[PDB]
């Protein structure tokens, strides 16, 4: 016996209504079923229980209902707070696949800093050039590393954030780890930015000896 | 008011035994089942089993039942997972809690209280490798005038080749939270995690206000701070 969960991925404006199907393979009792929110780095906490009973504590925009095997949690108005990934489960407690729900909010243009690497980091042989994009959406941008206008691979590597429960936007970090040998045969590491807020992608750069 | 915590060991070795214990601190176990979940580093939240307080009944998934006993002292008030033959693959966030419906005290014949997970509390990182240790390299994201935008100025610190996570950073020993966005680790080739943590401050209080940032990882006892400077 077994639980689906769908949509898997759901993108929504702050302030709408949200719906989640959680879909059992049989029949089930309305008492077997809960409804689970999970914080990226929190503890997943019970949203409802028995199918409609409402956790303690849980705001009222959160309603649950449902029979047979058609489960349904409900976000009548979506508050930016709300993103994180919504699971459900049976009684002897195994499944739910889950739903990653984004807050969908305005176009935001990512600001661009550049870090050169440290004197420390240079005495060990190693140099980190760090290019950061914060506080921007929609999620997906372009970071080309460019070394006197020369274009890398492989030895750029980029993280970005979870998304912010209070705004709702992404930062993003893009780390070009090159050997300090590899850093003094150029002259200008520059990092071009492109993203959907931005007229045209920007550049920041700077010289080696600064 | 119960609440729970998970904990264990900070890395296992490949064919070894994992074990993880969570600790029930604001009630006893009695009348209820204890549960085990958990994350892999992509996925979501696998069930592992649960064991009825008094430890008389138990039901695991099926996939772990053969390396996976869960055993409960109600006198210590902690909960023990033993999965044996650990994998990679059980490299996980081990999360901890509480089954359920009210419980209810049940029998030998009918154990039919089951119904909800409340509190569940962060539960622990499990890596699984046959790798050892390292301790993080700290150096400055320095707020050069590459990183002045107007009023608005950016530092932070790179927190490199470490190994396994967790690594803890904070900044002014815990007094700057505003405009923190300490990144996820990104496993490198090397196979070590490598991280930077951001702080974009006013202009004006570069020159009062001095920042550090404090880089904490339990795994090698390292903890160092790094002033932040031009």
């Known amino acids: 016996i077994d639980l689906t969960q769908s949509p898997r991925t759901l993108s929504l404006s702050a302030g709408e209504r949200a719906t989640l199907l959680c879909r059992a393979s049989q029949s089930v009792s309305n008492v077997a079923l809960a409804w689970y929110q999970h914080k990226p780095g929190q503890a997943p906490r019970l949203l409802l229980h028995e199918a409609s009973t409402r956790a303690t504590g849980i705001p009222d925009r959160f309603i649950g209902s449902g029979s047979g095997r058609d489960f349904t949690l409900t976000i009548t108005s979506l508050e930016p707070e709300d993103f994180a990934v919504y699971y459900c489960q049976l009684s002897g407690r195994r499944l739910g696949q889950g739903t990653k729900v984004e807050i969908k909010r305005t176009v935001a243009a990512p600001s661009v800093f550049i870090f050169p690497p440290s004197d420390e980091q240079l005495k060990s042989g190693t140099a980190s050039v760090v290019c950061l994009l914060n506080n921007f959406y929609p999620r997906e941008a372009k970071v080309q590393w460019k070394v006197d206008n020369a274009l890398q691979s492989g030895n750029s590597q980029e993280s970005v954030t979870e998304q912010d429960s209070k705004d709702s936007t992404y930062s993003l970090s893009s780390t070009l780890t090159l050997s300090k040998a590899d850093y003094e045969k150029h002259k200008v590491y520059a990092c071009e930015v492109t993203h959907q807020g931005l007229s045209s992608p920007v550049t920041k750069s700077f010289n080696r000896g600064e | 008011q119960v609440q729970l915590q998970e904990s264990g060991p900070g890395l296992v070795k490949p064919s070894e035994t994992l074990s993880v214990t969570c600790r029930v601190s604001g009630g006893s176990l009695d009348l209820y089942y204890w549960s085990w979940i958990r994350q892999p580093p992509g996925k979501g939240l696998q069930w592992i089993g649960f064991?009825?307080?008094?430890?008389?009944?138990?039901d695991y998934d099926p996939s772990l039942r053969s390396r996976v006993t869960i055993s409960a002292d109600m006198s210590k008030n902690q909960i023990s997972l033993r999965l044996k033959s650990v994998t990679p693959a059980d490299t996980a966030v081990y999360y901890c809690?509480?089954?359920?419906?009210?419980?209810?005290?049940?029998?030998?014949?009918?154990?039919?209280?089951?119904?909800?997970?409340?509190?569940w509390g962060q539960g622990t990182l499990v890596t699984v490798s046959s790798a050892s240790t390292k301790g993080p390299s700290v150096f400055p994201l320095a707020p050069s005038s590459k990183s002045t935008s107007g009023g608005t100025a950016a530092l932070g610190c790179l927190v490199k080749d470490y190994f396994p996570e967790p690594v803890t950073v904070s900044w002014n020993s815990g007094a700057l939270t505003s405009g923190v966005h300490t990144f996820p680790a990104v496993l490198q080739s090397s196979g070590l995690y490598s991280l930077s943590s951001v702080v974009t401050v006013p202009s004006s209080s570069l020159g009062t206000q001095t920042y550090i940032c404090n880089v904490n990882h339990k795994p090698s006892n390292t903890k160092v701070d790094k002033k932040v400077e031009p």
């Open positions: 809690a509480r089954l359920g419906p009210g419980g209810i005290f049940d029998r030998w014949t009918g154990h039919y209280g089951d119904k909800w997970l409340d509190p």
């Open positions: 064991v009825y307080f008094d430890g008389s009944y138990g």
